[PDB]
Design a binder for this molecule. Structure first.
Ligand SMILES: CCC1=C(C)/C(=C/C2=NC(=C\c3[nH]c(/C=C4\NC(=O)[C@H](C)[C@H]4CC)c(C)c3CCC(=O)O)/C(CCC(=O)O)=C2C)NC1=O
Ligand SMILES: CCC1=C(C)/C(=C/C2=NC(=C\c3[nH]c(/C=C4\NC(=O)[C@H](C)[C@H]4CC)c(C)c3CCC(=O)O)/C(CCC(=O)O)=C2C)NC1=O
Ligand SMILES: CCC1=C(C)/C(=C/C2=NC(=C\c3[nH]c(/C=C4\NC(=O)[C@H](C)[C@H]4CC)c(C)c3CCC(=O)O)/C(CCC(=O)O)=C2C)NC1=O
Ligand SMILES: CCC1=C(C)/C(=C/C2=NC(=C\c3[nH]c(/C=C4\NC(=O)[C@H](C)[C@H]4CC)c(C)c3CCC(=O)O)/C(CCC(=O)O)=C2C)NC1=O
Ligand SMILES: CCC1=C(C)/C(=C/C2=NC(=C\c3[nH]c(/C=C4\NC(=O)[C@H](C)[C@H]4CC)c(C)c3CCC(=O)O)/C(CCC(=O)O)=C2C)NC1=O
Ligand SMILES: CCC1=C(C)/C(=C/C2=NC(=C\c3[nH]c(/C=C4\NC(=O)[C@H](C)[C@H]4CC)c(C)c3CCC(=O)O)/C(CCC(=O)O)=C2C)NC1=O
Ligand SMILES: CCC1=C(C)/C(=C/C2=NC(=C\c3[nH]c(/C=C4\NC(=O)[C@H](C)[C@H]4CC)c(C)c3CCC(=O)O)/C(CCC(=O)O)=C2C)NC1=O
Ligand SMILES: CCC1=C(C)/C(=C/C2=NC(=C\c3[nH]c(/C=C4\NC(=O)[C@H](C)[C@H]4CC)c(C)c3CCC(=O)O)/C(CCC(=O)O)=C2C)NC1=O
Ligand SMILES: CCC1=C(C)/C(=C/C2=NC(=C\c3[nH]c(/C=C4\NC(=O)[C@H](C)[C@H]4CC)c(C)c3CCC(=O)O)/C(CCC(=O)O)=C2C)NC1=O
Lengths: 161, 160, 68, 96, 160, 161, 161, 161, 160, 160, 161
């Protein structure tokens, strides 16, 4: 994986360049937002379970999805689905701390679209589950962090569609 | 970085980051501005550090620039200082990130095998790095010179 | 981080081994604390006998410091 | 059979057996059959040998000294650091 | 601690500590006296924090102190504030260590069985701890209150 | 390990004897109690968790054992202890079905006394945890099965002391 | 394995005591020496190889030990011996950082005396190899750290004898 | 393991000595008996099964050992016992070829006394099984080889008692 | 030896020796007197061979015997030839054993770690061994010189 | 072959061939012409060898060629000698390869299952092979007859 | 895998033919070159490291390949590349001993072209690394063996292109 900082280091390493003014400006733009990323992660982590619960309630359950014939019918599959939800939330929190989406590609999106096609897992319904968790997250983390958390949920959801 | 290291340990355990590892990051952010500044300072004097490192090296070990020496001759010496320029660069990278991380992948893992093939005496490369510490350290304030010095001593350590 | 010391006789009645299985039946080995229960039971289930148990590495009722 | 790959089993005592031989015997012998078992562990668990920093000694030291079995040497190697790193970390979770 | 977590990484790779690892020990230890003050203040008000936590928590979810409730009665309740006293203590052993290892061995490892076995409602319990947050946090400066708050939110997180 | 039917077969097979009226009488004495053993097992299995809970409540918790300095202090230890309790209950149920204690020796008692000495696990306190589960079991299974279940709990507890 | 910060917590936990004034004084006595421990570790780590080389030169080689009949005869055994030396140095550096010798017992001394008796490894000669590395270490680390590094080398060496 | 020749090489290697007259005389004393060792091994190998059968017949079966209560009662244990016998015969043949008993210690005797105590395997009865195979072997191999084969059977049997 | 190697493989597969294994013991033992003659000749000229190889090693690697060289000085050179005497001895052992078991346990397993510690350049030790091959080989008939040469090239191989 | 066996063990341990492995290849290849002569002689007398094995077999077991016998009748006997011709062929292959790899994959692995299905008495097939040993062995010099005999006794062994 | 000899045996086995004159002539053509193959392998093995170093020096390093942006940039990748080189050399030595290229297909070429396409490993540059090692090998092994070693390097290199 890479973060903001190693994204820059590797981009310069392939050119064998010492870090110059443009590089140093990018890294500053990361460091200057760093404390806010940490606070936001502590809110998400400590509200993890409630975010999933409120996101499922707005976007998944009370529906045909949870009824016989639906993909989140059976305690087995309901458990698998909210298990997935926890992955998304947790990794988006990593991406936002790192200030780089590369981890969402390497460890979450790669092959996932076809995995879901192969099992029958409804993609559009999963995206709504992602964009509902974003909605909840953006309330809990506040002005400071709302836009920055949000983008990695949006990265996740355009990665499936 | 400090970030990468903290996170990788977090994810391995599959639980959000703690308190105790959500701190170090805060220290690093404050440190990073200073860390970025030290790297820039090192970058400014690179040609002087390398050249003076190279003199300090060949006095202390004249055998490498002698008939049966790996660095014997004008080029074989030119490539040797270029390698010293490489490692100073990696040292600036290490300082800025706050964690050594990328430098390891770029220039120590595999370095024994590379230099053994070329027949380069590894411990005299470690000396060239000590020589760079001495020069670089004389262009930095006491506090910044120590912070830089840890990364020089790491490279010296890894070639071992 | 604690380790156990262990002694057991593992005997195979119907399998029949031709050569040199003396290390195979009787042995002493160090096992970690977290795998002992499963190791112990791997041994009871195939008819083995456990001669002795050694911590080797821990302290007896340590509340902290134990950890994995 | 000979239709499949070799199976290495460490029957050779190991154990730092001792004897009725000279106290600081040079040749010793047969604490070199363990050594091929040790490299063959690496060749299954990672597929190749590791580089110099990488090898896990102090797991081998104990196997070679007879303190732990083959089974536990595999466990140490499996739960190790470079094994995680090489094979877990960079891939999608189920590919890993 | 930070030491325990980190050295473990050193020994597992058969090596001395990195410049990075050394730096974080230094930054960590510099933040010592403050952490000790945060633990002292909270140790000094433990009886107040527990008692006021206990009043607060039976508003946000009372049913537990009712006919079919796990904490119904005087001695089913008192074992309840004592458990709240336990967790505040752990929130302070951990504060001085600068990470969670000590707390974890004594309190969140295999803690979802004690409770499941006891059929204490665990998720109410997380709420119980968040409340020792509200009281404790009102006896600390803004900066120290946040630093303390991370450890309260961890326990709340682990009971989940 | 053997059952009841082959513990008699092995007694006569280390003699060369055949099955002599005496053997056939023993086997009858087992078969004739068999149906009663089966439910009793169905009662224990389906009340497993409640038996442990009531046995711990009468004989272990609300005590110095669960307090700092006590062996079942820490969630990790408390979990290990009631885990053990489940083993005892489960195996005693096997012994009682088999009508033979040999499984309690082979897979539970062998080395356990010294294992507990080595960890510091209090033996006397563990016996009370066994004899409390017996008390609960004897109520739940009824007149039919009470004496037969009870003996394998008593086998377990004199195996430690 | 435990340290000074951790030991204070465990030592009090078994008594169920809040940290009190005496405890808080002990922890201060550790924190107040902490920066010096770190600097000392960075000197040892970065001079590791030279310390072993100078310690072997003063206390092991140029001797019957390295000659035929000697235990560090053969490249195999010479390698094993200086491998060991690196362990000692490295772990002593851990003990000194932790400000607690418990790791030297758990991961180095336990069984080592008999292991050396069983292989024939000369104990007295190994102690001199430890006390020579201490001598070198005490020069390199300076007034600040000399006494504190030294004790864990002395812990190691009275652990073998 | 070691043979005659490597026994000498390692005894000199630890002294770092080139082979001298005394060494060279020892090696000659081995080489000069070598052809006879080979012929003897070919007789033993090709009569392996008959030697075991005649040794068992003189020293094990037709007895309480093979009757109920006896250690070689059951086809399982009878098979294990003559399996063992084959090991002894085969390894003694190795020792005699090598002209060194070290292999009998490394791969046969180490721990075997206690292994037999732990299973209940009768030691004295096993020795008679060894000394009966020796008796048969000494007839089959002839004057040339009788004494040399015999000693490694005697090594085996005083290794158990 | 050839014996030890054959047997160890036999015992490890729980079996008597193969026709192949028996054949090689027979061919080996037939070469006994010849192998003993090869060792005698070389034992008889051990001084000549070790000295000469040192002159030739120090011609291709003049700096080993130079300011920053591992063998620089009269007694750093004395130990160097002593090591060359050690390896010639082991080569005579190997030739009479017909394999490397003895050569290996005595002087290659652990040799990297030993010499790395002493900071001896391994590949120039390999050169010292080639130099001994050249001298020793000039004191042996064509057929015996080849048979000896395999064991020299093995040591050269193992230091690699 | 001897080659295949040596190599497979080499590759599986990730290494070059041992002195031992090299020695056996050398002894083996030296016996090449002899092994080829042993196969030629037996190939040249194949038709004779099967009829004398077949006579020796039917005297010793007239039942196999009896009402309830697997080989009862003219064409149940024709197939039986054809199987004896198959195994003699495989024995010539084994002798020139110097091990059983080929013999094994072609005619012993799976042979129990094949013959059990056909209800052929396996141990009387083993007798047919002993009978072939006796005939073949009478057309070879003492030394070559033994070398051949090992491969006959192997097949006899594998049908067991 | 197969060698010269098993290539012939399996070609006849599928026809169920005893070896005939044509077969016997082929096997002779192998045996008659056998001693030379062995000598050549001993030269390659013992010069392994020097062959790689001279082959890399003529065909890989001092180039854009080893510079930033190049595939053998970084100590990691430089190590992987000369690791590969050692495989090629070692296996070609196996193929040449066996007198059959089948091992080069089974254990080296199968999937390797696409593996290199997937990682970005430059194929043409790797072939030059193979044909440079051949050049060095052909000098070291001499007239006797030059052509025979060479072909399996050529097999390797047309296997990638
Ligand atoms: C056939 C397998 C299967 C089961 C059993 C199942 C249960 C299930 N129970 C639910 C909610 C619920 N279930 C209960 C049940 C109870 N409340 C209590 O206190 C009592 C202990 C218990 C009644 C005996 C309650 C109160 C909710 C609402 C919880 C909420 O909305 O947060 C929901 C979410 C609402 C929905 O979308 O349907 C599911 C999926 N789903 C399945 O696929
Ligand atoms: C670490 C990164 C990672 C991810 C994200 C991951 C996803 C993932 N989801 C899976 C299944 C699944 N995923 C879901 C998800 C859902 N069901 C619905 O109806 C909703 C639309 C949605 C939840 C919002 C369900 C129901 C299954 C079970 C399919 C089955 O029954 O086989 C599986 C198959 C294996 C298994 O069942 O566990 C994987 C690997 N695996 C990974 O390694
Ligand atoms: C390669 C060297 C080697 C040896 C020698 C060896 C011996 C050996 N004998 C064993 C058992 C045994 N050994 C015997 C032997 C005998 N019974 C008698 O009454 C006679 C006195 C005697 C035969 C003469 C029997 C009966 C057992 C089975 C004990 C049981 O039932 O568990 C076992 C236990 C595992 C097993 O059952 O296979 C070992 C390891 N193992 C080895 O690896
Ligand atoms: C330091 C680690 C640690 C903890 C936390 C711990 C808790 C613990 N809580 C207990 C009981 C209890 N705990 C509670 C707690 C509650 N009731 C509620 O409804 C609320 C949700 C909650 C208060 C916030 C109650 C009511 C009991 C009595 C339950 C019973 O007796 O059945 C008991 C059994 C009584 C005893 O023997 O002490 C233990 C061991 N033990 C430990 O070693
Ligand atoms: C399948 C048969 C079987 C049994 C019965 C078994 C028991 C057993 N109990 C253990 C520990 C333990 N056992 C207890 C038990 C208790 N604590 C108390 O205070 C009470 C008196 C008692 C419960 C009533 C505790 C607390 C530990 C943990 C000791 C430690 O911290 O290391 C361990 C050590 C490994 C582990 O921690 O899991 C084993 C193997 N293992 C087995 O394989
Ligand atoms: C029989 C198995 C065996 C070997 C081979 C062995 C070698 C060995 N070589 C040593 C030193 C040495 N060896 C060399 C050798 C060389 N310098 C170079 O540059 C060249 C590459 C090479 C000569 C060809 C040098 C220079 C030293 C001194 C290094 C020092 O003192 O730091 C030492 C330490 C000094 C001593 O105490 O003897 C040992 C033990 N020991 C053994 O038990
Ligand atoms: C992580 C903690 C740890 C330690 C400390 C450790 C020591 C240790 N030293 C060993 C052997 C040894 N240790 C030495 C040490 C010496 N020789 C001398 O003459 C000197 C007096 C001394 C060096 C100063 C030697 C020569 C051997 C090899 C013995 C043999 O040939 O079997 C072995 C046997 C396995 C092996 O050979 O690697 C162990 C386990 N193992 C561990 O896991
Ligand atoms: C960023 C990671 C990295 C490093 C460090 C690196 C080093 C490196 N050093 C090289 C050569 C060299 N390096 C040296 C260096 C020295 N000679 C001495 O004696 C001294 C000990 C030392 C100078 C301090 C010499 C003399 C050569 C030429 C060797 C030859 O051509 O055979 C070469 C081959 C020439 C080339 O193609 O560039 C590489 C790739 N490559 C990398 O990708
Ligand atoms: C046993 C048979 C076998 C072979 C041959 C083999 C090749 C092989 N080469 C690899 C990578 C590689 N191979 C190279 C090779 C080169 N780089 C260059 O620029 C040169 C053109 C060339 C050397 C001459 C490099 C640089 C990589 C690393 C690619 C990466 O960074 O992922 C990998 C990926 C796994 C790894 O990195 O180790 C394999 C499997 N694997 C096998 O199992």
């Amino acid at each position: 994986m890479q973060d903001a900082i190693t994204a820059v280091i590797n981009n310069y390493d392939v050119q064998g360049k010492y870090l110059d003014g443009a590089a140093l400006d990018k890294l500053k733009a990361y460091f200057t937002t760093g404390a806010v990323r940490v606070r936001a992660a502590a809110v998400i982590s400590s509200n993890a379970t409630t975010i999933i619960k409120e996101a499922a309630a707005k976007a998944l359950i009370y529906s045909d999805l949870t009824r016989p014939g639906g993909n989140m019918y059976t305690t087995r599959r309901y458990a698998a689905c909210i298990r997935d939800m926890d992955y998304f939330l947790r990794y988006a929190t990593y991406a936002m701390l790192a200030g780089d989406p590369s981890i969402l590609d390497e460890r979450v999106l790669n092959g996932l679209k076809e995995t879901y096609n192969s099992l029958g897992v409804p993609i559009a319904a999963t995206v709504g589950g992602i964009q509902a968790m974003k909605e909840v997250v953006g309330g809990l983390v506040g002005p400071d962090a709302a836009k920055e958390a949000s983008i990695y949920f949006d990265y996740l959801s355009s990665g499936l569609s | 970085s400090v970030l990468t290291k903290a996170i990788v340990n977090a994810d391995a355990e599959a639980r959000y980051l703690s308190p105790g590892e959500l701190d170090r990051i805060k220290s690093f952010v404050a440190s990073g501005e200073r860390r970025l500044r030290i790297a820039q300072t090192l970058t400014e004097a690179r040609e002087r550090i390398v050249k003076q490192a190279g003199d300090q090296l060949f006095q202390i070990r004249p055998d490498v620039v002698s008939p049966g020496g790996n660095a014997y001759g004008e080029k074989m010496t030119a490539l040797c200082l270029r390698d010293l320029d490489y490692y100073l660069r990696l040292v600036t990278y290490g300082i800025v990130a706050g964690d050594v991380t990328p430098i390891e992948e770029i220039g120590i893992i595999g370095v024994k095998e590379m230099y053994n093939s070329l027949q380069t005496p590894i411990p005299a490369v470690a000396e060239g790095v000590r020589a760079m510490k001495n020069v670089a350290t004389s262009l930095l304030s006491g506090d910044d010179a120590a912070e830089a010095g840890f990364y020089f001593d790491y490279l010296v350590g890894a070639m071992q | 981080s604690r380790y156990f010391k262990v002694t057991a006789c593992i005997p195979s009645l119907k399998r029949v081994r031709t050569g040199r299985e003396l290390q195979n039946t009787f042995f002493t080995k160090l096992v970690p604390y977290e795998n002992w229960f499963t190791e112990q039971q791997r041994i009871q289930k195939a008819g083995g006998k456990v001669l002795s148990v050694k911590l080797f590495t821990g302290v007896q009722g340590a509340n902290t410091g134990v950890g994995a | 059979t000979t239709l499949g790959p070799k199976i290495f089993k460490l029957t050779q005592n190991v154990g730092f057996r001792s004897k009725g031989m000279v106290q600081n015997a040079g040749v010793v012998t047969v604490e070199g059959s363990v050594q091929a078992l040790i490299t063959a562990a690496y060749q299954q668990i990672f597929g190749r040998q590791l580089y110099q920093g990488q090898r896990l000694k102090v797991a081998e030291i104990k196997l070679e000294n007879g303190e732990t079995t083959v089974k536990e040497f595999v466990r140490a190697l499996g739960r190790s650091e470079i094994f995680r790193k090489l094979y877990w970390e960079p891939f999608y979770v189920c590919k890993a």
